[PDB]
Amino acid sequence: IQLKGTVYNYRTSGMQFCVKMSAVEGICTSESPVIDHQGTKSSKCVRQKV
Amino acid sequence: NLHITPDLIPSFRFVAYYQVGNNEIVADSVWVDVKDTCMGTLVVKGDNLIQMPGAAMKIKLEG
DSSP states (O other): OOOOOOOOOOSSSOOEEOOOOOOOTTOOOSSOOOOBOSSOBOOOOOOEEO | OOOOOGGGOSEEEEEEEEEETTTEEEEEEEEEEOOOOOSSOOEEEOOOSOOOTTOOOOOEEEO
């Protein structure tokens, strides 16, 4: 599958943002972004502008 | 009915009199405080949402 999602920014000017999703035993992720640091298991830091 | 208008800010007096037969004059004065306010209008309109440093800003100016 390809999970779609959408970030809206309602505010005045532009705004940047990170969306990272936690992986789980049973879901290959395609990247080895697993990066565990200070107790935390998450995805690389996107860095999109909206 | 008197129509207050900005001028009378902040305080205006009322004096009044009548004359009987072109010889007697009798009068009275009452003093009134008008709301100590702006003669005209002036407000800086904005959005009040939390801005971010050096960011682009818009403020409307009503006057």
